Amino acid sequence: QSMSVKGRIYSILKQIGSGGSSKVFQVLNEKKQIYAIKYVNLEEADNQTLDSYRNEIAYLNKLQQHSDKIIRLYDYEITDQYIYMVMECGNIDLNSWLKKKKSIDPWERKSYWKNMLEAVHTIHQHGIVHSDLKPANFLIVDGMLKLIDFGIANQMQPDGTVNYMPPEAIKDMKISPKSDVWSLGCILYYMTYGKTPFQQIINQISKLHAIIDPNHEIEFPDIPEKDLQDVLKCCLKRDPKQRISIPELLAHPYVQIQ
Amino acid sequence: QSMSVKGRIYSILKQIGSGGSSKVFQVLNEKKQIYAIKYVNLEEADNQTLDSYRNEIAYLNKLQQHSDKIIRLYDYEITDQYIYMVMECGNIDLNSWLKKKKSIDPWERKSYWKNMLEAVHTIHQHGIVHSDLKPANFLIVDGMLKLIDFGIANQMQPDGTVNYMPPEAIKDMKISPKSDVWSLGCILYYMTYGKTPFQQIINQISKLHAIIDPNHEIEFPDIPEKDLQDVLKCCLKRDPKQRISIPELLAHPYVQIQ
Numbered sequence: 267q268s269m270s271v272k273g274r275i276y277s278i279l280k281q282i283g284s285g286g287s288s289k290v291f292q293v294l295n296e297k298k299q300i301y302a303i304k305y306v307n308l309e310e311a312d313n314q315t316l317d318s319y320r321n322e323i324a325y326l327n328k329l330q331q332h333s334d335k336i337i338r339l340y341d342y343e344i345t346d347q348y349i350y351m352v353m354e355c356g357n358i359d360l361n362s363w364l365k366k367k368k369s370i371d372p373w374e375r376k377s378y379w380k381n382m383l384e385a386v387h388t389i390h391q392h393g394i395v396h397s398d399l400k401p402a403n404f405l406i407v408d409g410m411l412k413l414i415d416f417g418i419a420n421q422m423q424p425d426g427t428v429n430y431m432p433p434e435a436i437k438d439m440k441i442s443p444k445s446d447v448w449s450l451g452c453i454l455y456y457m458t459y460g461k462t463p464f465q466q467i468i469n470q471i472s473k474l475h476a477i478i479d480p481n482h483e484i485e486f487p488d489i490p491e492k493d494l495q496d497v498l499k500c501c502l503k504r505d506p507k508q509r510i511s512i513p514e515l516l517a518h519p520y521v522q523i524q
Numbered sequence: 525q526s527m528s529v530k531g532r533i534y535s536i537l538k539q540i541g542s543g544g545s546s547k548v549f550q551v552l553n554e555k556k557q558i559y560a561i562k563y564v565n566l567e568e569a570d571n572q573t574l575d576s577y578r579n580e581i582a583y584l585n586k587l588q589q590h591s592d593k594i595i596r597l598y599d600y601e602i603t604d605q606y607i608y609m610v611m612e613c614g615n616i617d618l619n620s621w622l623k624k625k626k627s628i629d630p631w632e633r634k635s636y637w638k639n640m641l642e643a644v645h646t647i648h649q650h651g652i653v654h655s656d657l658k659p660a661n662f663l664i665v666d667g668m669l670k671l672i673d674f675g676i677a678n679q680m681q682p683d684g685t686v687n688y689m690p691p692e693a694i695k696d697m698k699i700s701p702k703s704d705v706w707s708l709g710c711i712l713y714y715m716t717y718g719k720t721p722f723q724q725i726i727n728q729i730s731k732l733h734a735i736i737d738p739n740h741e742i743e744f745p746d747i748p749e750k751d752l753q754d755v756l757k758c759c760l761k762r763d764p765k766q767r768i769s770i771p772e773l774l775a776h777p778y779v780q781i782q
């Protein structure tokens with residue numbers, strides 16, 4: 267199999283991920299340089315849906331220059347039937363990496379945390395709040411985490427959880443940059459304790475109650491990294507006004523002191 | 525490997541499912557009759573947690589005589605460290621069966637629906653509302669669906685979604701027998717259209733908004749079974765007061781007329 271994007275021919279090596287509409291292929295250029303091509307079938311999309319994709323592509327293009335923690339978009343082809351996005355290819359996504367890895371090095375966890383903060387901070391500056399952050403939104407590209415999507419459009423699975431949901435999103439049934447801080451906090455909590463804060467709960471109705479319940483208390487077992495434990499407690503504050511911000515997290519001893 | 529339950533020896537053939545605390549083994553008696561042994565490790569459980577398991581076992585024992593649509597519990601062993609439940613062994617659970625099967629026969633769907641209603645109605649009579657219904661709570665035992673658990677205690681996965689959640693569970697952040705009707709309605713909607721009502725949505729915050737949104741409208745594409753389409757529309761009414769009940773669903777032409 268093969269495909270054409272803006273005149274250039276790419277030969278499909280394999281399919282990386284499956285999406286209801288979207289597909290991601292590991293491809294090779296004539297030069298034989300590797301790339302990831304995201305394909306979106308638009309043949310059943312509405313105007314509102316089309317706009318989200320258009321918005322997401324527009325922000326992806328614009329944010330290229332702003333940070334290197336955002337996945338490289340090299341080119342794209344947009345018609346009425348489909349969208350082709352030529353992106354850099356990563357080694358693996360963070361969710362698949364975390365499932366394969368039992369124990370994670372403290373310097374690896376700190377390096378990944380810093381990258382996540384830089385990527386999320388960049389989007390916040392441009393008025394974008396992801397609101398759907400989870401490990402699957404991060405790509406490992408040569409020991410560096412890069413943010414794959416902005417939450418403006420749809421998501422996929424390789425070839426859905428409420429574990430990273432902030433309390434204010436549930437209580438409002440409101441969402442601000444602080445919502446992204448809670449979700450990042452759950453990703454760091456997982457990379458630290460091997461599990462999300464409310465991962466143990468089975469009943470989904472009960473899990474949602476716990477997240478918004480002031481009385482329910484998250485457990486922060488004592489660890490050698492005292493700075494890391496403080497970050498977790500700061501990110502996982504139920505009141506978004508009292509929750510730590512990203513510019514503050516970037517000035518924290520956990521990120522700054524080695 | 526082998527295990528002892530109430531004096532009787534069972535040899536483990538294989539592990540069927542994995543739970544954080546619970547485990548399910550396909551075992552053989554000395555007679556060489558097959559059984560499923562559920563093992564629960566209690567070594568880290570609290571009093572409240574212990575009570576739920578005790579309650580769930582007590583209802584499982586009591587409901588044996590009331591319906592054959594509830595999984596057979598033959599024996600059990602309860603100590604301070606663990607719980608062993610000797611149950612009948614099924615062919616496969618409904619979730620695994622639905623993933624393997626692309627198209628389902630209309631008589632198979634109707635037969636399974638009837639069994640589900642009988643099992644859920646039996647629990648409702650004894651004042652139990654499951655509140656966590658999904659295909660994984662149903663076991664296929666010789667062309668008959670049997671309800672595995674009562675939602676009083678924890679759940680497992682073979683060796684978590686918000687897709688079956690009723691609107692009243694979200695709006696109250698209330699739960700009555702009508703909540704179970706919505707979840708059964710989502711299972712039937714899946715067995716009919718091949719997908720849950722809000723399955724397409726990716727953003728979990730957005731999916732929750734849609735479920736409780738009166739304006740959002742579920743799509744009921746025209747099918748040859750007119751009675752089936754009416755049941756779906758009746759089960760998936762957002763107001764629980766206007767939502768159809770189980771005793772009514774048992775009198776519906778879809779269940780009664782062939």
Ligand SMILES: COc1cc(-c2cnn(C)c2)ccc1Nc1ncc2ccnc(NCC(C)(C)C)c2n1
Nearest residue numbers: 283290302354355356357358359362402422423424
């Ligand atoms: C060889 O490459 C890869 C391998 C794996 C991998 C290895 N094992 N498993 C289980 C998965 C994952 C990702 C990649 N690479 C890659 N590069 C660019 C992308 C751009 C957009 N979306 C992507 N993935 C969407 C997903 C998977 C997160 C839902 C991308 N994935």
Ligand SMILES: COc1cc(-c2cnn(C)c2)ccc1Nc1ncc2ccnc(NCC(C)(C)C)c2n1
Nearest residue numbers: 541548560612613614615616617620660680681682
């Ligand atoms: C051979 O037997 C089986 C095979 C499979 C099967 C086949 N393929 N896959 C993917 C799965 C599933 C279930 C059974 N049988 C069985 N019998 C009694 C049970 C009592 C309690 N919980 C059970 N399962 C818990 C679960 C899996 C729903 C989380 C029981 N499962």
